[PDB]
Design a protein around this ligand. Structure first.
Ligand code: ADP
Ligand code: ADP
Ligand code: PAU
Ligand code: PAU
Ligand code: CL
Lengths: 360, 362
């Protein structure tokens, strides 16, 4: 077995995801034998919810009483900005991390980008793993163990109507084939036919990084939480041109209802229209623009590949039920109920979990 | 049999209204005798001005010269104004007695529906409402058949990525079927066209010319489409976007994404340091690239799935926009290994108005 601490790391374009297994079956004789530095890092991780200026433990994602590699313990889910990787590597140097063990399993593009820095500054060797391989392994494992007596995955029934929208549970029991849409900084779209057989069908650079980046420019927001806050009190219809702004109603010949967006941000060439919108409106418009584009591309991929279940993951979906409901409606409405959107509780961490499972 | 002059086709879109006008160059003194005074003044109003009111523009360089149409010889003009100024156009309609020219005017686009009642009450005119996509098909097929004053209507870019070798070469739309037609307006409609009577709307995207123009106005303070493109021509998108390189330190080799490909459009703009580094021009360039490559990607997927190898891109998003045309041409060529060809047109934004004109003449 590998030595503690057991970590999986996913170094993305925007966020670094870190999954840590805290063993809870340490005997007296093990505690006796254990090194001070290991004891210190373990209590640093489990007694702090914030780490430095930017690191955060998502306490309510904690999976309790899992059995991994013959040990009973808890899974912790931790993230920080990729921008703060130099501080992270410096920490490994200063905390003597190579003495606990020299090799760590890491995925994401940062596993390649930062390899030399880890080696030179930290004296650490990365076991580099593919970001989409790790994603698949992680979602399947996290699904099979469940979420402390609740389901890992779910779907939205009647996602368009706030009068009847329900979040209902769903299992990946016999899940294949499935389309997996990974919404990070960019978007990858995977057709998955078994645990071992899958292909990257397409992607789009209009991802969560485009949402967050545009919001910062358009609204002066600086955090994702603030962007979403603004979006949840905004009205996109003031910013966008709807089909009814162009037709005065539906474009029935081609089944385009008046409420559908004809042109994203399409009113903003008008000074009068620009003057009447708020930062909140611009945030919401950015949200629906990016989401509906992804939804449309996933729909086309789903129908072409003859796949009816589409799973949406990635940290774009954090605190983003607005996006999840739009994606749900987008697939259901335009496919007349043939296509189904599925979502997950640990949306951003499956890659890091995959890196941890590889270790073990 | 044919209707009396004047002959017009109208396309009232989300952003622009397009008017096509056949100027007769075969008017006899005898016909003039029979013509009403409102017709005489409107004809000279159209031909002696290249700018109408506050915002009307005649695209003089598109004029089709010495055309024969329904037994009459003359020139076809192409005129545009913002849909925002429709109230003034309708009022001008009453001031210039448009109803004494004709009771009915042929109109396509969403605005043919939206402004119908206004045109009747204020303007004294009935609109003959016609389908925007049908008129688009009839217009491009007609305009291609006549050609552009000796030149071809449609064309492609050979070697679009390299300014050393980039060439605009003619493309004959004789036996063109099947083709994908990508109409880039405020929004985008994507058609698979199997014949002149047989086509379907495959899909579309709301991320269109209106998204490019709207975002550019918000992000840069530009007020015109021309300014937006001028700004984009002097910008560097790689300060704005996050490349595959920025994430991987090179290519993502497993799935063949080269280091230089965009991973996340506007992805650097979460960083305050990066935001302070960029200019208005960089943002305009990033906006142009993001909207264009997204349309290209979507069109590529439609073309491949429908087994269509020819994609004609139209709409006023592409007006004075050789940069976006070259990006579309490159992206389709590169990401399909030379299997898909991008085609473009000289009268990009006026095909629907032409269709409305042809409907008028039977
Ligand atoms: N606290 C946060 N900081 C930055 N981005 C966040 C945050 N919360 C959610 N996001 C969203 O998550 C996206 C990155 O998602 P992720 O799945 O981690 O992909 P990547 O591998 O590109 O980092 C961002 O583009 C943003 O939209
Ligand atoms: N002078 C202009 N004014 C406004 N938009 C322009 C102009 N020139 C080009 N455009 C572009 O053309 C688009 C409108 O395209 P068009 O094909 O006329 O569609 P629509 O029918 O939606 O008006 C705008 O969104 C903008 O991108
Ligand atoms: C480069 C990755 C794979 C990094 O996760 C992702 O950001 C992405 O797939 N971006 C855009 C993909 C595309 O243009 O198809
Ligand atoms: C509504 C029209 C047809 C009007 O030109 C056009 O703007 C459009 O096709 N918009 C995109 C709608 C969509 O496909 O989602
Ligand atoms: Cl006339």
């Amino acid at each position: 077995r590998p030595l503690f601490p057991w970590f999986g790391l996913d170094i993305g374009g925007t966020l670094v995801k870190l999954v840590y297994f805290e063993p809870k079956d340490i005997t007296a004789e093990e505690e006796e034998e254990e090194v001070e530095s290991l004891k210190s890092i373990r209590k640093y991780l489990t007694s702090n919810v914030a780490y430095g200026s930017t690191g955060i433990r998502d306490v309510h994602l904690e999976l309790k009483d899992l059995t991994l590699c013959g040990r009973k313990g808890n899974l912790h889910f931790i993230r920080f900005p990729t921008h703060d990787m130099p501080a992270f590597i410096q920490m490994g140097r200063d905390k003597n991390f190579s003495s606990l063990h020299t090799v760590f399993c890491a995925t994401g593009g940062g596993a390649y980008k930062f390899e030399q820095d880890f080696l030179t500054i930290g004296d650490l060797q990365l076991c580099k793993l593919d970001e989409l391989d790790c994603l698949i392994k992680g979602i399947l494992y996290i699904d099979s163990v469940g979420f402390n007596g609740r389901s890992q995955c779910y779907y939205f029934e009647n996602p368009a109507d706030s009068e009847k929208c329900q979040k209902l549970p769903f299992d990946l029991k016999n899940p294949y084939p499935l389309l997996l849409v990974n919404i990070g900084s960019g978007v990858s779209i995977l057709a998955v036919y078994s645990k071992d057989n899958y292909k990257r069908v397409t992607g789009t650079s209009l991802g969560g990084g485009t949402f967050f980046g545009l919001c910062c420019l358009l609204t002066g927001c600086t955090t994702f939480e603030e962007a979403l806050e603004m979006a949840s009190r905004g009205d996109s219809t003031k910013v966008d041109k709807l089909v009814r702004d162009i037709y005065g109603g539906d474009y029935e010949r081609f089944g385009l209802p008046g409420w559908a967006v004809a042109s994203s941000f399409g009113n903003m060439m008008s000074k009068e229209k620009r003057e009447a919108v708020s930062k909140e409106d611009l945030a919401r418009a950015t949200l629906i623009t990016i989401t509906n584009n992804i939804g449309s591309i996933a729909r086309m991929c789903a129908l072409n590949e003859n796949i009816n279940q589409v799973v949406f993951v990635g940290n774009f979906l954090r605190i983003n039920t607005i996006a999840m409901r739009l994606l749900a409606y987008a697939l259901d409405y335009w496919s007349k109920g043939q296509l189904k959107a599925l979502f997950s509780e640990h949306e951003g961490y499956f890659g890091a979990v995959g890196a941890l499972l590889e270790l073990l």
